[PDB]
Design a protein around this nucleic acid. Structure first.
Ligand SMILES: Nc1ncnc2c1ncn2[C@@H]1O[C@H](COP(=O)(O)OP(=O)(O)OP(=O)(O)O)[C@@H](O)[C@H]1O
Lengths: 420, 84, 438, 604, 85
DNA sequence: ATCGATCGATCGAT
DNA sequence: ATCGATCGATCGATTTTTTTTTTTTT
């Protein structure tokens, strides 16, 4: 018996720290990085009173997000027979407070990102996940209270906002979309335009992209009653070449992938590459997290040049691909974390363009057993060839002239539609 | 101080209120009988030159450790030094 | 002439002299009231002095200016810990260096008031330790019984600045603790006292109660105590014209380039060419800012090195006294973080507070360096920044600050030999990198 | 009375504010101009004004400005009310903000005294810990729903409660509530605390900061860690956290004993501490400027010529954009120039570091690591994992310079190389994931392992570093120094004049500023060579690397195909300097030849 | 504030053990305590340098396990040369 | 536990 | 006699709070 529209793009396109009382009470779409949040709680929704002296049910009152007053004199009489809520006939709803800081990539230099409260009601609640890059269309207000008896000087109601809508970083299929979209699928040669739509601006190896096409497309686990589901995700590996587009491609997959996370090698890109979290009740509740792959589950892993990685984090490397569930010893809290991610790897060969004609075990310091978890090895080349760059440099120059493949929306929907 | 000395100003005299332990509840207004039953009660606050004081020191006292049982712990004992 | 007022008195000139022999007592019995008559009498004693010269200082208004006594050297007070209860209010000679200086505290003088009507501005001074506001009323008079409006920005104020001070009277009873001292002060006494400085500051004793609950009217028993800070006594340069000529004379002297060097480190023996360098650096260089940029300064830093216990360290120990702004730090005890931007929590205000580093206070004047060879590799890098930019860039923590440090520096060097030994490579002997060394 | 006492100065100032402070006539800046300060303000109607305090100190001879000083806070209202009365006289949803400037003197925090309360005062010092903005009330609807509210007014002093007069109504009140935000006018505010300046403080006492809230449009104007001139609005606020101080803190003697503290409001602040385009057209006409821009580059340095140009070239990158879908093609550029120490290669970095805006520099040895990395910062407290950028981000879309990559070792060479691929970098440790944007032009200098040549040294192994970080930067551009008696006299001549206080008269063709503004004019361009001469560039790359196949012991490299990419960004840099879009092959030859010598430095 | 040790031992003898394990933080202080007549703290707002008249004696153990006669002097010692000088 | 405000009545004024 | 303000008895609300297991850095 209820619905509300999320609607659509409403610039704004304002960030965080830029907002004003001019923006208050009027809906403002806003951007920010998802942060820690409370668990979903029941909301008072519609108030009602079994009261005291005056009789039940008295009928429900509409409150509140969030005020609910004042019930002075009523329902019989007045008081002391005064209004009080009862569990019966009282509608409720899900509620979640959330923290979302402004995006560090959008963070002005040397200035600390600002914290922002994130309100959640109805369907919007719990749909968000912490650490996500996200957009929100809210309404900025002085809301609420104001006491805050601490301030006082200068007297203010601490600002809070609930976005009508939320969107992950930064699309879904529909009938009329998928239906003709199904008609695309019937062709067999579609496989090629999948290479054609693979990385059209990249050119590159049709072969290297083939392996790209493979793990990128995903697959069934598949479960074995009542035991292991084996591994439905591809662990992708790339033997690099200096000067080659290799580092660039996974980045294509980045905006390509519905769910994607790239921590690169180490030093270390986000984040710790593993779950370090210990609580700490106190303080205030602390926060718990897993490895980098925890951020995206069923989403493919993105990493490059493990050679620059520390061996400690590199243990989780072979670790993640193995059990397909994350685990660590710190500290008192005990669980079993299950994360399933396709895993991409591209690392540059030791030394020169090609390490040795001798077997890649000679090529790489990395152990075969840890490499063993890699089903696909992407090896590249080559020594200079005459026409080779004519086939590319001419391609490349024409690429930069800007200033066949499926539209990425279709192809990106294609896989997600498939994985779903 | 054992007893504050308030002074009524207007009615004057002298006020002495006992105080025990760590705290006290200070008197106000005027209790002076000249200001008693008269519409005007004199103002008063403590006169430190007037009121008597007592020097108060204190110390914890640890056990000699030979007296102690083989187990448990040394017992500190709060004491409060006063006067000469 | 100066119209400075605030006379510092003497104490004791009431002894031995007559009369005032009892006033010398009577002042020590009740110093507060004594200053009250005396600050006023000085006014009339000025006014009485001016009537003989008749028209003075344009004219009678300079007498309208307030005068006051700031008496010192009252007997000799014994440390702090000795202090008697009987001593409640009397002048006290004291010594100690300031542990902490609090931010200036505002105080009440004359409270400002208003009613609902008219609204009207009638107010009464804070006066005593209480503020008594009439229920009504000014304007319309009337009455009527309106709440009395108080705008605190209108009412009078003055500075009272709290300083906790740990005295070091020595003669410490043992096992007595290094007790400290509370102080409030007032006006010029406020803020005029730098923290960390041993001082003769004198004042009457003071103790006042405080509410236990800080809600309930109940006060906690015995009163907390603080200093009345009656008087202070801690311990651009403008040179008189004549010795300046002696500079022009001493400059005419032939050996000043040398004779000054013997006076540079008279305590020190030989190593004169070493003194000669010390002689140059203090006067080292001249600023060129050009049209823009430039600023190679005069800043010149020469590292001393050689045999251990050459008394090479006595120079810097000595030179440290020399420079108006000097710097001296041992190796490995000083860190690159100690050279700039501490940014520690104030911890009294419960908020992080940025602090200039060793190099920042190093900025200006000479700087001595112990164990520069022993210095951390994170160290010298902040210095290489100083070596080139003549500045320190702090982007760390919450804020970006690229701060200038322009200052002389000299490092003490201890050869790893420990003897430098005959022959050998030169630079390799000193250790440290050639880029650092050259 | 006092109503009129300020009202006197009111009409005194109201007429005064109407009156012309502009003495300049004819050429100008011929009056009024304060009314124009309204007019241009009426252009954007931002409800604020800049006005000089000094000019009021002029006409009234400061006598009114005297009233502006101590009697300020009390007399604030008469300023704008008459101004709004002037507004009502002139201009038409109305609340205003006044900003004074050019105050007689700046005062220190230690300089601060109680007599200074209610008196506007100029102060400066470094910013610390700015706070996020929260709306303040000062005007709002608050009244009891019984019988009706109808009351929006006053309650401006910080309480913010409460409603008093003509409640409820009609029952006696007082009463209770009701604050209505739906009808309220709010503004600002963000809170900050200025740290006292470092050079001011005597060591080692340390400075004592106090809180300065930023009211008015001055909010958000604050940049933390910056010393800035502050207009006074000195005031004060009650402090309930002072106990065991002790007082005396006087009471109302319903008892809450007054303790007021120093809170300095920021009313106004300054961060310190047309025909020009004709010059461009006058500059754009000059052909020799292509040479002149170079000779005007860095006179503080002696010679090295072509090395200079690239500096400018690093100062204007390529399109750093497109071409879809997709990936955004670079963009940027890189150089690390190396050679014998005392080459004064330092001349370049310190040149442009104090030259180009937001140009960042480091010792290039101990940042330590983060530095550019996230710490990641601990603790909080109350939390952990605080993410610093740090270091080289802030140079974003700007030229970054460092020294001796061999000094920072490999540990950060990883991420250093990382930022060179992904540009913007993702970062954290056991914290929340993040991807930080760094798109930054980068140069640096790492001294030769021998600091010499070693001419027979292949530059590849000569640099003490990996090829990818090597191949990433196009290009390093080695140079060497040796004694030349002609130049030794030239060095003896040219260099000492640098040492010289004079002659400082010697100059390059261009003022560094006029070229820099010209830079931005050059920055505006997005020259795109789609010209078929680009095809000619291809074999030029073919002819570039067909020879480098044999042998590999020469400058190879390969050469890298990315070299053609920079070959793109080379022309990307060239056309901007020449101002023409779509460039030319002759220009293409230039960047091509540039690489040639760039590459030949790897020869022998 | 509560001081002690060197500050407490000033104008008197200070006996010391585990002198090799006093590490750096102590060594530099007593390194300065060899400059004697001073204790220097630039820490916090405290800039003071207070007189330490302390008489100094510390017995310290040779490099592990015990001293080896074959070991040359100063190789056996765990203390810095400038510290022994 | 005490302090705080509400609220009730009553004795004077008009 | 109507109205008030005045005092008092009525009513009810406010009184403690930071240390030992940690963890990314060389
Ligand atoms: N086959 C190719 N087709 C098109 N462009 C290419 C190709 N190979 C290389 N490039 C170009 O070279 C660049 C390679 O950069 P990338 O992001 O791949 O880092 P990387 O070279 O893999 O780093 P490293 O080689 O040091 O690991 C890209 O900008 C790309 O445009």
């Amino acid at each position: 018996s209820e619905i509300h529209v999320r609607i659509s793009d409403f610039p704004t396109i304002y960030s965080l720290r830029e907002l004003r009382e001019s923006n208050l009470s009027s809906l403002v779409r806003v951007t920010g990085v998802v942060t820690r949040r409370t668990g979903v709680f029941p909301q008072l929704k519609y108030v009602k009173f079994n009261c005291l002296k005056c009789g039940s049910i008295l009928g429900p009152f509409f409150q509140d997000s969030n005020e609910e007053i004042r019930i002075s004199f009523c329902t019989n009489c007045k008081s002391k027979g005064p209004f009080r809520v009862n569990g019966e006939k009282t509608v409720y709803r899900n509620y979640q407070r959330v923290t979302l800081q402004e995006a560090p990539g959008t963070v002005p230099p040397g200035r600390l990102p600002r914290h922002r409260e994130v309100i959640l009601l109805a369907d919007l609640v719990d749909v968000s996940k912490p650490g996500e890059e996200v957009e929100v269309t809210g309404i900025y207000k002085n809301n609420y209270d104001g006491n805050l008896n601490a301030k006082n000087g200068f007297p203010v109601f601490a600002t809070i906002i609930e976005a009508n809508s939320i969107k992950r970083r930064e699309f879904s299929w529909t009938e009329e979309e998928e239906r003709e979209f199904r008609k695309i699928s019937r062709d067999r040669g579609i496989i090629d335009k999948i290479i054609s739509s693979m990385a059209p601006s990249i050119y590159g190896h049709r072969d290297i992209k083939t392996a790209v096409a493979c793990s990128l497309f995903g697959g069934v686990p598949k479960n074995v009653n009542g035991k292991h589901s084996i591994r439905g995700d591809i662990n992708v590996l790339l033997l690099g070449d200096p000067g080659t587009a290799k580092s660039q491609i996974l980045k294509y997959v980045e905006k390509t992938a519905h769910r994607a996370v790239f921590a690169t090698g180490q030093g270390a890109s986000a984040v710790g590459l593993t779950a370090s979290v210990r609580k700490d009740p106190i303080t205030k509740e602390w926060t718990l997290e897993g490895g980098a792959l925890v951020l995206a589950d069923k989403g493919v892993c993105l990493i490059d040049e493990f050679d620059k990685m520390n061996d400690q984090d590199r243990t989780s490397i072979h670790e993640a691909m193995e059990q397909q569930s994350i685990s660590i010893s710190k500290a008192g809290i005990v669980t079993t974390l299950q994360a399933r991610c396709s895993i991409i790897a591209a690392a540059n060969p030791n030394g020169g363009r090609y390490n040795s004609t001798l077997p890649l075990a000679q090529n790489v310091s990395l152990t075969e057993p840890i490499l063993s978890r890699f089903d696909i090895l992407c090896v590249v080349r080559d020594l200079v060839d005459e026409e080779a760059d004519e086939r590319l440099a001419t391609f490349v120059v024409d690429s930069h002239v800007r200033s066949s493949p499926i539209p990425q929306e279709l192809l990106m929907k294609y896989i997600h539609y498939a994985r779903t | 101080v054992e007893v504050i000395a308030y002074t009524c100003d207007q009615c004057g005299y002298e006020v002495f209120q006992e105080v025990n332990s760590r705290t006290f509840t200070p008197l106000s207004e005027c209790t002076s009988e000249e200001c008693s039953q008269n519409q005007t009660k004199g103002q008063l606050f403590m006169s430190t030159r007037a009121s008597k004081f007592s020097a108060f020191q204190e110390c914890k006292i640890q056990e000699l450790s030979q007296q102690v049982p083989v187990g448990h712990i040394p017992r500190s004992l709060n004491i409060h030094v006063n006067g000469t | 002439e100066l119209g400075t007022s605030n006379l510092n008195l003497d104490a004791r000139n009431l002894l031995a002299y007559k009369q005032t022999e009892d006033l010398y007592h009577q002042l020590l019995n009740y110093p507060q009231e004594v200053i009250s008559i005396m600050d006023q009498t000085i006014k009339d004693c000025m006014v009485s002095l001016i009537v003989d010269n008749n028209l003075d200082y344009d004219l009678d208004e300079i007498e309208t200016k307030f005068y006051k006594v700031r008496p010192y050297n009252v007997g000799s007070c014994k440390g702090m810990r000795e202090l008697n209860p009987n001593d409640i209010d009397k002048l006290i000679n004291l010594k100690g260096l300031v542990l902490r200086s609090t931010p200036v505290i505002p105080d009440m003088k004359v409270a400002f008031f208003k009613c609902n009507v008219c609204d009207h501005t009638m107010a009464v001074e804070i006066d005593r330790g209480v503020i008594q506001e009439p229920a009504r009323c000014e304007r319309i008079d009337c009455n009527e019984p309106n709440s009395m409006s108080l705008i605190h920005n209108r009412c009078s104020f003055a500075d009272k600045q709290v300083i906790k001070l740990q005295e070091t009277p020595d003669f410490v009873p043992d096992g007595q603790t290094p007790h400290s001292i509370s102080l409030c002060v007032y006006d010029e006494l406020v803020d005029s006292c730098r923290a960390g400085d041993r001082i003769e500051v004198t004042g009457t004793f003071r103790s006042i109660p405080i509410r236990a609950n800080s809600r309930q009217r109940v006060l906690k028993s015995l009163y907390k105590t603080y200093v009345d800070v009656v008087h202070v006594k801690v311990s651009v340069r403008q040179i008189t014209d004549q010795d300046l000529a002696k500079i022009r004379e001493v400059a005419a002297r032939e050996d000043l380039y040398s004779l000054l060097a013997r006076s540079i480190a008279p305590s020190i023996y030989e190593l004169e060419d070493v003194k000669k360098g010390i002689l140059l650096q203090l006067f080292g260089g001249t600023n060129k800012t050009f049209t823009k940029g430039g600023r190679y300064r005069g800043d010149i830093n020469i590292l001393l090195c050689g045999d251990p216990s050459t008394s090479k360290s006595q120079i810097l120990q000595y030179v440290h006294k020399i420079t108006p702004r000097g710097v001296y730090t041992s190796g490995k005890g000083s860190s690159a973080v100690g050279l700039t931007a501490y940014i520690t929590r104030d911890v009294d205000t419960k908020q992080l507070v940025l602090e200039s580093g060793a190099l920042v206070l190093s900025d200006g004047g000479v700087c001595c360096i112990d164990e520069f060879d022993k210095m951390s590799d994170s160290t010298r890098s902040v210095l290489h920044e100083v070596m080139e930019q003549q500045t320190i860039s702090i982007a760390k923590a919450g804020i970006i600050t690229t701060l200038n440090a322009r200052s002389s520096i000299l490092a003490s060097a201890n050869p790893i030999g420990s003897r430098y030994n005959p022959n050998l490579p030169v630079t390799e002997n000193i250790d440290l990198p050639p880029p650092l060394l050259s | 009375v006092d109503d009129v006492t300020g009202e006197k100065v009111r009409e005194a100032f109201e007429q005064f504010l109407e009156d012309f402070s502009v003495q300049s006539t004819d050429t100008g800046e011929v009056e009024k101009v304060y009314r124009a300060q309204i007019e241009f303000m009426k252009i954007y109607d931002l409800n604020t004004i800049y006005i000089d305090y000094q000019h009021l100190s002029m006409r009234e001879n400061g006598a009114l400005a005297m009233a502006i000083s101590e009697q300020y806070y009390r007399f604030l209202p008469f300023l704008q009310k008459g101004l709004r009365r002037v507004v009502r006289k002139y201009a038409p949803e109305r609340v205003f903000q006044i900003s004074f400037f050019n105050l007689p003197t700046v005062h220190r925090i230690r300089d601060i005294r109680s007599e200074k309360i209610g008196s506007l005062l100029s102060i400066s010092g470094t910013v610390t810990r700015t706070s996020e903005v929260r709306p303040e009330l000062y005007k709002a609807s608050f009244t009891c729903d019984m019988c009706r509210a109808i009351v929006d007014n006053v309650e401006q002093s910080f309480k913010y409660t409460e409603p008093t007069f003509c409640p409820n109504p009609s029952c006696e009140n007082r009463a209770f509530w009701t604050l209505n935000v739906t009808r309220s006018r709010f503004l600002d505010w963000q809170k900050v605390r200025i740290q006292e300046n470092a050079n001011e403080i005597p060591t080692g006492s340390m400075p004592r900061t106090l809180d300065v809230i930023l009211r008015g449009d001055s909010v958000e104007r604050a940049k933390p860690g910056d010393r800035c001139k502050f207009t006074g609005v000195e005031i004060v606020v009650p402090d309930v956290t002072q106990l065991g101080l002790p007082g005396v803190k006087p009471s109302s003697t319903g008892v809450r004993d007054l303790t007021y503290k120093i809170s300095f409001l920021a009313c106004h602040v300054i961060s310190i501490g047309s025909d020009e385009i004709n010059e461009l057209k006058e500059m754009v006409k000059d052909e020799h400027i292509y040479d002149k821009l170079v000779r005007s580059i860095a006179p503080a340095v002696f010679g090295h010529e072509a090395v200079k140009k690239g500096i400018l070239l690093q100062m204007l990158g390529g399109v750093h954009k497109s071409t879809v879908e997709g990936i955004k093609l670079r963009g940027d550029i890189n150089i690390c120039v190396v050679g014998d120490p005392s080459t004064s290669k330092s001349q370049f970095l310190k040149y442009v570091v104090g030259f180009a805006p937001r140009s960042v520099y480091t010792s290039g040895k101990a940042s330590s690591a983060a530095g550019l990395t996230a710490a990641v910062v601990r603790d909080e407290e109350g939390g952990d994992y605080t993410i610093e950028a740090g270091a080289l981000m802030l140079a974003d879309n700007g030229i970054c310079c460092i020294d001796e990559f061999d000094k920072m070792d490999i540990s950060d060479q990883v991420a250093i190389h990382e930022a060179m691929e992904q540009q913007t970098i993702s970062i954290a440790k056991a914290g929340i994931h993040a991807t930080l944007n760094a798109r930054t032009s980068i140069l640096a200098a790492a001294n030769p392992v021998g600091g010499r040549y070693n001419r027979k040294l292949s530059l590849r192994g000569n640099l003490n570093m990996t090829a990818p970080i090597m191949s990433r930067f196009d290009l390093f551009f080695v140079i060497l120094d040796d004694c030349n008696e002609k130049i030794d006299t030239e060095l003896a001549s040219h260099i000492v004049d640098l040492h010289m206080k004079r002659d400082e008269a010697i100059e390059p063709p261009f003022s560094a500023e006029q070229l820099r503004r010209y830079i931005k004019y050059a920055r505006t361009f997005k020259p795109i060579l789609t010209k078929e001469a680009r095809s000619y560039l291809v074999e030029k790359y073919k002819e570039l690397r067909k020879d480098d196949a044999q042998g590999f012991s020469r400058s190879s490299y390969r050469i890298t195909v990315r070299q053609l990419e920079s070959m793109i960004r080379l022309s990307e840099a060239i056309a901007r300097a020449n101002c023409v879009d779509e460039i030319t092959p002759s220009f293409i030859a230039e960047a091509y030849d540039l690489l040639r010598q760039s590459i030949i430095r790897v020869d022998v | 504030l509560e001081g002690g040790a060197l500050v407490l031992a000033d104008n008197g003898i200070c006996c010391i053990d585990e002198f090799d394990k006093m590490d750096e933080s102590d060594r530099t202080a007593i390194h300065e305590v060899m400059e004697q007549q001073t204790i220097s703290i630039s820490k916090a707002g405290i800039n003071t340098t207070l007189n330490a008249r302390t008489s100094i004696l510390a017995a310290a153990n040779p490099l592990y396990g015990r001293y080896n006669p074959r070991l040359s002097p100063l190789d056996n010692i765990n203390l810095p040369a400038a510290l022994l000088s």
